[PDB]
Amino acid sequence: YPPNLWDYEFLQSLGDEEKHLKLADKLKEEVKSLIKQTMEPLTKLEFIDTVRRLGLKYQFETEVKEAVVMVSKYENDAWWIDNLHATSLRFRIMRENGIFVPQDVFERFKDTDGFKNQLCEDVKGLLSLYEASFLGWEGEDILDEARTFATSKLKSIEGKIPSPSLAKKVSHALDLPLHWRTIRYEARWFIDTYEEEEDVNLTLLRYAKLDFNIVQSFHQKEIGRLSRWWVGTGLDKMPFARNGLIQSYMYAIGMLFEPNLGEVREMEAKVGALITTIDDVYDVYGTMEELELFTDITNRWDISKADQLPRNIRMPLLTMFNTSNDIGYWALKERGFNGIPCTAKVWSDQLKSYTKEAKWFHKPTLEEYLDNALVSIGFPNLLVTSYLLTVENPTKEKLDYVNSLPLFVRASCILCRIINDLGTKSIQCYMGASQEVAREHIEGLVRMWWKRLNKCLFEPSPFAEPFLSFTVNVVRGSHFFYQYGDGYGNAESWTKKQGMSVLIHPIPLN
Amino acid sequence: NYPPNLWDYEFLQSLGDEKHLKLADKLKEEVKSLIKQTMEPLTKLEFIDTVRRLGLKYQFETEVKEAVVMVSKYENDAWWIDNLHATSLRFRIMRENGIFVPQDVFERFKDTDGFKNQLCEDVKGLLSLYEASFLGWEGEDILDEARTFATSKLKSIEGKIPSPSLAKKVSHALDLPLHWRTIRYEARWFIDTYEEEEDVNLTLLRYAKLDFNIVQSFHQKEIGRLSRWWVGTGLDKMPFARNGLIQSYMYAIGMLFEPNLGEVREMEAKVGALITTIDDVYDVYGTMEELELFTDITNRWDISKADQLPRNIRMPLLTMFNTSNDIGYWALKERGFNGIPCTAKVWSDQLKSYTKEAKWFHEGHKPTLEEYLDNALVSIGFPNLLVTSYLLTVENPTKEKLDYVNSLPLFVRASCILCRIINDLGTSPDEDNLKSIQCYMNEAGASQEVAREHIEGLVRMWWKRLNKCLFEPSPFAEPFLSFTVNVVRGSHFFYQYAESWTKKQGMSVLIHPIPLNE
Ligand SMILES: CC(C)=CCC/C(C)=C/CC/C(C)=C/COP(=O)(O)OP(=O)(O)O
Ligand SMILES: CC(C)=CCC/C(C)=C/CC/C(C)=C/COP(=O)(O)OP(=O)(O)O
Ligand SMILES: [Mg+2]
Numbered sequence A: 001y002p003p004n005l006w007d008y009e010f011l012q013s014l015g016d017e018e019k020h021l022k023l024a025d026k027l028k029e030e031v032k033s034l035i036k037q038t039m040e041p042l043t044k045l046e047f048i049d050t051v052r053r054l055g056l057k058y059q060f061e062t063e064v065k066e067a068v069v070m071v072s073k074y075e076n077d078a079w080w081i082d083n084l085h086a087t088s089l090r091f092r093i094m095r096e097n098g099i100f101v102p103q104d105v106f107e108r109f110k111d112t113d114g115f116k117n118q119l120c121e122d123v124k125g126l127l128s129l130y131e132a133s134f135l136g137w138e139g140e141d142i143l144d145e146a147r148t149f150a151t152s153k154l155k156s157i158e159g160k161i162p163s164p165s166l167a168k169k170v171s172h173a174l175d176l177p178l179h180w181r182t183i184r185y186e187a188r189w190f191i192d193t194y195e196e197e198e199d200v201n202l203t204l205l206r207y208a209k210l211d212f213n214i215v216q217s218f219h220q221k222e223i224g225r226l227s228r229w230w231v232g233t234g235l236d237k238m239p240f241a242r243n244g245l246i247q248s249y250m251y252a253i254g255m256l257f258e259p260n261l262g263e264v265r266e267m268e269a270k271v272g273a274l275i276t277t278i279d280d281v282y283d284v285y286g287t288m289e290e291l292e293l294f295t296d297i298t299n300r301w302d303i304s305k306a307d308q309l310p311r312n313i314r315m316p317l318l319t320m321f322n323t324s325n326d327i328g329y330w331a332l333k334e335r336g337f338n339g340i341p342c343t344a345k346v347w348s349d350q351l352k353s354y355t356k357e358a359k360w361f362h363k364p365t366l367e368e369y370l371d372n373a374l375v376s377i378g379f380p381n382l383l384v385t386s387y388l389l390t391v392e393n394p395t396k397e398k399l400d401y402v403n404s405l406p407l408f409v410r411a412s413c414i415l416c417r418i419i420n421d422l423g424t425k426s427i428q429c430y431m432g433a434s435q436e437v438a439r440e441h442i443e444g445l446v447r448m449w450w451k452r453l454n455k456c457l458f459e460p461s462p463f464a465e466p467f468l469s470f471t472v473n474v475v476r477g478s479h480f481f482y483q484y485g486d487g488y489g490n491a492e493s494w495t496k497k498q499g500m501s502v503l504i505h506p507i508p509l510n
Numbered sequence B: 001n002y003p004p005n006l007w008d009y010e011f012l013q014s015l016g017d018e019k020h021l022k023l024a025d026k027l028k029e030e031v032k033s034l035i036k037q038t039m040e041p042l043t044k045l046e047f048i049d050t051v052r053r054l055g056l057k058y059q060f061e062t063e064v065k066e067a068v069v070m071v072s073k074y075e076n077d078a079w080w081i082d083n084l085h086a087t088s089l090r091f092r093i094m095r096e097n098g099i100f101v102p103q104d105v106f107e108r109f110k111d112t113d114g115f116k117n118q119l120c121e122d123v124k125g126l127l128s129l130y131e132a133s134f135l136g137w138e139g140e141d142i143l144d145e146a147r148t149f150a151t152s153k154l155k156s157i158e159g160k161i162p163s164p165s166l167a168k169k170v171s172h173a174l175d176l177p178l179h180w181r182t183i184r185y186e187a188r189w190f191i192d193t194y195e196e197e198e199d200v201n202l203t204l205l206r207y208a209k210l211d212f213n214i215v216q217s218f219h220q221k222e223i224g225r226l227s228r229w230w231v232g233t234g235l236d237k238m239p240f241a242r243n244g245l246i247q248s249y250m251y252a253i254g255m256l257f258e259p260n261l262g263e264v265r266e267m268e269a270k271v272g273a274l275i276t277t278i279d280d281v282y283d284v285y286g287t288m289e290e291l292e293l294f295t296d297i298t299n300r301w302d303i304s305k306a307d308q309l310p311r312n313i314r315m316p317l318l319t320m321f322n323t324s325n326d327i328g329y330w331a332l333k334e335r336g337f338n339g340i341p342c343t344a345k346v347w348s349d350q351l352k353s354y355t356k357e358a359k360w361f362h363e364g365h366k367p368t369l370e371e372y373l374d375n376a377l378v379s380i381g382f383p384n385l386l387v388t389s390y391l392l393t394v395e396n397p398t399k400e401k402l403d404y405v406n407s408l409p410l411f412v413r414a415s416c417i418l419c420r421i422i423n424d425l426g427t428s429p430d431e432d433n434l435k436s437i438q439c440y441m442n443e444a445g446a447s448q449e450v451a452r453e454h455i456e457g458l459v460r461m462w463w464k465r466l467n468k469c470l471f472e473p474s475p476f477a478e479p480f481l482s483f484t485v486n487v488v489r490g491s492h493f494f495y496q497y498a499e500s501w502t503k504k505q506g507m508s509v510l511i512h513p514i515p516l517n518e
């Protein structure tokens, strides 16, 4: 009978060739040579764009950067000038690696009246223009016009593209730009698309497949441990909530997939699973009387009065307490800093955000609602925790600063809340206007906050890797998953399908 | 790790990462048939004693008890009367099963002066009388005489018996009687010994080896989980409590080995690993001021001030706190009752008892044996381990039930005192006013030999009370009844009056399967 991705008995069993580990190190070194070897600079950009989209950039970070720096120093410009595909790919890859390119590189493709209508048949160029547009910042208006233009022309030629790989790429891009997609879920999709390309490199393809299955094996061990944990909490047998742990994990794979960040991912997934559960306690099951004991226990970090809550509320509460204590403790053991005050504080702040939302049943300004809704979405919890677990030399002062939610963090948080609200009170709050115009306007705030995030990555930061990646990648996870959160019908089968292709079924090899 | 543990953890996880299962059910049904089949009554008692000693009673509880009741009802007594071996074995097996037999059955083996010296011509008889003596109660004078007589006669031949199996069994018995040995470690030893005896049943022996290996595979997965948890706490890198996790787990297997008690066994092993670690924090690391704050935080169950403790003290403290919360939460999730107040309470009681010992040590107080033992039956950690075991297993746990077990009814008190005194007796000539022998030496102005003899007499006395409590178990039921007795057997086995021997036991019982000729 069908292996069920929601069945915790099935999930608990995951993580039960050493041959093909050897071939991976060999193909890896072959792929390293390919990235370093001399190519035409366009062929080079396309090669490392390919490495990125196969989910392999984490394996070749030094070689990809040195490659991108080489192309940025290639002194002769004839190779991209007047070539729409090449201008747009060089723009995107350069901005992606923090090398500034001006929106003026797109001047030869437009005039005072805008982009030439003669570009409607350059599909590859239209698609590369489209993808590059989302690397733009606020006030970069040529980039804004490029998007609206490439979007219209691509929509018109859809279904009239002879190249199999190119037709698939256009359809995929118009649903979500590459810039908004997760690395790991994109990687599984692109392995299939790349294999149909004219210029496919069989050594890169073979290595893409082998690395993906090796990484997948790491994830399966993670899901087993997390499922055993979840069943050990008894929260899988709770009413009021849905999948919880497995959905939280699928998200966390969007936030971070690298085997070397496994422990942090598992903890993020746990916190994710508790946020969905307690959100439902506060937004559907708990009564007023119950939420104030729960909040109050959390504020004081004192479980003396826990036994005054009923089972179905007491269990979420004590699991939050015990997990927050465990993650705080991990910081002390591994990072030399007791993180319990930090985890207790992000839970106390998150419960207050939930307590304002429930008092309001008042009708706030979109500004007032987002001020609170960027906390209740639980990405301050998740991101402050991810920073506690990874920053070099954590201190109280550094944790007070990230928890103050400066722009870079605040922009990720608002983006997560807004993408969540687009995927069913952001629309209601804004709307003396209609739903259609409120939606369109929120979609606008998405575009705007992404420009703010993009620019932040160029701007002086106290932040480093991996937290920089965590803060952008939560938004991508939000883009990819919130579209399909309904829990039934088409959204459930698409989610199950992503789950099964990325977490369960390996890629057939040679 | 440095210093090196008995086994590396990566190896311990290696361990747990279909013919024989089907064969196990088939041999199990064949052994049921043997336990049920008509035998002469002495032969049936010998068979069910063999099943017990091979570690298999937990597979045949119904059949063994029904076989025992059948023999208790066998009308004609000619098969045991005037037979020392049969009288002894019948007495022991009956009492182990709650069927009273009076000490008076031994009177015919005595004359006016005591046990007849001619009984020394039958070593099997002497060994059965020795083993049976340990099922005695207070005021059963004839069972004390039997112990003294059998011990002396057997010792007059230990090491010089020209019959291999009996020689091994007598030597083994003189070290610890069967009654005081663990089930699981005895099973591994006796599988070897039984294979070498004259009356071996190869079906029973085959099943013993198969069931051993299957239970062992459950243990291997547990040690993998516990090793991952322990490395996760970082307590393996404390500069104390070398081998704390593996030793706790080895001891837990003596307290309870059954696969169906896996979760409880894992939690007990976690508490035992923390007791060893924190005992070290109190005895060989913390200052008085550090230990005051440790104790105060635990009393209040409030870790606000934890960061005032240095890392190597703070990490044990917070692991105690997190694990106690996890164990209490398991009782809520699984048993419907929030056990956090209970686990917090037994840790507070235990740390208060460590603080009292430390105060005596620093003030130069020389407690009486009675003052020492009142506190030291708590400091040994068995009130903690036992109350926790009761929380996790009792049907319908309540505050009133947990308060009762933590009030130390005689049964529990006897077990905790025994574990402490046995621990104190296992110490070599060593540099201590704060141990049983020395406390009694100070009290009575007694020598070390006389004091040790007195404490050995206390062990025999408390076992008599434990034995009698099982005939009136009162509020307790299985599995707590077995745990309360089996922690004492664990103590005898692990503190025999050291590294190589521990590693040998771990290797045969946990690491290496028994070779099957199958
Ligand atoms: C990276 C990671 C591990 C993430 C965990 C995924 C996750 C679902 C996080 C919390 C957000 C949430 C409650 C989504 C759906 O509930 P909702 O829309 O009902 O929430 P709301 O009531 O706040 O709108
Ligand atoms: C059932 C089970 C899982 C048992 C775990 C083993 C265990 C830790 C038992 C308690 C006794 C103890 C603390 C021994 C350590 O040596 P020590 O002699 O220093 O103890 P002391 O300082 O109190 O004398
Ligand atoms: Mg909500």
Ligand SMILES: [Mg+2]
Binding pocket: A279, A280, A283
């Ligand atoms: Mg909700």
Ligand SMILES: [Mg+2]
Binding pocket: A420, A421
């Ligand atoms: Mg929502």
Ligand SMILES: [Mg+2]
Binding pocket: B279, B280, B283
């Ligand atoms: Mg000690």
Ligand SMILES: [Mg+2]
Binding pocket: B279, B280, B282, B283
């Ligand atoms: Mg001590």
Ligand SMILES: [Mg+2]
Binding pocket: B423, B424
């Ligand atoms: Mg000791």
